Amino acid sequence: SSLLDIIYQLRQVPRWDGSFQFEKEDVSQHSFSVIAISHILCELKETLEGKKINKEKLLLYALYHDVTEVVSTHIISPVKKNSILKDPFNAFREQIKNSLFDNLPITLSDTLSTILNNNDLEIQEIVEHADHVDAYCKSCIEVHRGNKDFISIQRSLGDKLDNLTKEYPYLKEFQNLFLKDFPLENKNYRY
Amino acid sequence: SSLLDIIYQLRQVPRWDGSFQFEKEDVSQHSFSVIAISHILCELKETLEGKKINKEKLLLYALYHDVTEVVSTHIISPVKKNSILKDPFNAFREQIKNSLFDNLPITLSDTLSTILNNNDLEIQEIVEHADHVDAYCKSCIEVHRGNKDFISIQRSLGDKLDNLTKEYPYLKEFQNLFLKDFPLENKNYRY
Numbered sequence: 001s002s003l004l005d006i007i008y009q010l011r012q013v014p015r016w017d018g019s020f021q022f023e024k025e026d027v028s029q030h031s032f033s034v035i036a037i038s039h040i041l042c043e044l045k046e047t048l049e050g051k052k053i054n055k056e057k058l059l060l061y062a063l064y065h066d067v068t069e070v071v072s073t074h075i076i077s078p079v080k081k082n083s084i085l086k087d088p089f090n091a092f093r094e095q096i097k098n099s100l101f102d103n104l105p106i107t108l109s110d111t112l113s114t115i116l117n118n119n120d121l122e123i124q125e126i127v128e129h130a131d132h133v134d135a136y137c138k139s140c141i142e143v144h145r146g147n148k149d150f151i152s153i154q155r156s157l158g159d160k161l162d163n164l165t166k167e168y169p170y171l172k173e174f175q176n177l178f179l180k181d182f183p184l185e186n187k188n189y190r191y
Numbered sequence: 192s193s194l195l196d197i198i199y200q201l202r203q204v205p206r207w208d209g210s211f212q213f214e215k216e217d218v219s220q221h222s223f224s225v226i227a228i229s230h231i232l233c234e235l236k237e238t239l240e241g242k243k244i245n246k247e248k249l250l251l252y253a254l255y256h257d258v259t260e261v262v263s264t265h266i267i268s269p270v271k272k273n274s275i276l277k278d279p280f281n282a283f284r285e286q287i288k289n290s291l292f293d294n295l296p297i298t299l300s301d302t303l304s305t306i307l308n309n310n311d312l313e314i315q316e317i318v319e320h321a322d323h324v325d326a327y328c329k330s331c332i333e334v335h336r337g338n339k340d341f342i343s344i345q346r347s348l349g350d351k352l353d354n355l356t357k358e359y360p361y362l363k364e365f366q367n368l369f370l371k372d373f374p375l376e377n378k379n380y381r382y
């Protein structure tokens with residue numbers, strides 16, 4: 001199986017092509033953050049909307065949500081969501097899923113097929129939101145480092161996030177708990 | 192809460208201090224790999240030992256398993272496991288857990304307390320094994336890059352892993368599926 005190789009190969013997939021970064025980010029760092037944010041959003045959504053989400057399925061979907069970028073590389077959103085490339089890329093992404101599981105055990109084959117051909121719409125929603133939050137957090141850190149080139153990126157991501165908070169209350173709560181003072185200038189927890 | 196800041200601050204905690212690396216590794220990259228390896232080991236253990244593990248608790252424990260290193264930094268194993276520092280570091284690690292959850296919601300407070308003061312011995316075993324596997328994988332990649340300084344590291348980690356495979360059959364199966372050809376020189380899955 002290529003599965004373990006792929007997990008480490010995600011470190012070789014850079015994000016934010018075409019933008020200057022004080023700290024270069026790869027897909028593995030991004031996916032770690034998306035898993036943790038997905039967990040936090042899920043806890044808030046459960047308490048606010050009176051439900052229980054299957055956290056196993058959620059975390060595993062977050063874990064592998066960008067795994068197809070080992071083949072496609074990471075295409076930034078202004079290119080991926082262009083009306084010319086929008087549907088073609090989604091078709092490309094779908095061909096990648098149908099080609100990765102090889103020489104695996106059946107429980108591994110099935111679990112990975114379940115994850116990669118997921119049809120749980122709410123888990124897909126939570127991870128999509130966690131993905132936007134993480135992008136916003138990255139832009140916050142770069143601006144904090146002094147990167148003027150991310151100011152406009154922070155503004156459009158922030159504008160989109162503000163719109164989402166009006167329609168998804170668990171996102172507004174996340175914003176209130178974490179995103180109004182981020183990153184922390186004084187990391188008092190170290191001492 | 193410092194929780195979201197801490198998740199991104201783990202990128203500033205380097206591993207393998209005192210060894211030359213062709214690719215510098217941080218705790219967030221390492222934890223992403225440990226989560227995925229924990230999942231794979233858990234699937235194999237379930238099939239081989241006839242059980243079902245709580246994957247929510249497992250994945251969340253893997254996710255935060257080194258979170259206290261935002262305070263302690265990453266102390267390499269030959270120093271941490273020295274008979275002088277062994278018990279003191281464990282006591283230090285325990286003081287760190289009792290100081291991190293602040294201004295959180297109760298469901299977040301409790302979930303994080305559950306995770307950080309875990310007493311599920313088998314989940315702790317799986318993640319400890321995934322942690323050794325990941326260290327072995329890193330040494331394999333460095334040696335593959337041509338790093339002669341990791342040859343001796345690869346050998347002691349490999350020797351320890353071989354011993355573990357004699358006592359934990361799910362580890363031997365993982366070794367047979369993934370660790371006998373790692374990393375892949377020819378990444379055919381990209382094409």
Ligand SMILES: Nc1ncnc2c1ncn2[C@@H]1O[C@H](COP(=O)(O)OP(=O)(O)OP(=O)(O)O)[C@H]1CO
Binds near residue numbers: 017080152153
């Ligand atoms: N303003 C921007 N300028 C340049 N690149 C951007 C910008 N915003 C995002 N990116 C890059 O695209 C990556 C992901 O961003 P995001 O998640 O917000 O966009 P999508 O959800 O539409 O794309 P996705 O489905 O692939 O996640 C991000 C870093 O490379």
Ligand SMILES: Nc1ncnc2c1ncn2[C@@H]1O[C@H](COP(=O)(O)OP(=O)(O)OP(=O)(O)O)[C@H]1CO
Binds near residue numbers: 206266268271
């Ligand atoms: N031979 C080595 N030489 C130098 N550093 C090493 C070596 N082996 C491991 N390290 C570094 O220690 C980190 C973790 O290694 P490992 O997980 O195998 O050791 P422990 O399980 O005993 O330590 P832990 O409880 O903190 O995980 C690793 C990279 O920094």
Ligand SMILES: [Mg+2]
Binds near residue numbers: 128132
């Ligand atoms: Mg996105």
Ligand SMILES: [Mg+2]
Binds near residue numbers: 030034065066131
């Ligand atoms: Mg993503």
Ligand SMILES: [Mg+2]
Binds near residue numbers: 322
């Ligand atoms: Mg270890």
Ligand SMILES: [Mg+2]
Binds near residue numbers: 256
């Ligand atoms: Mg670890």
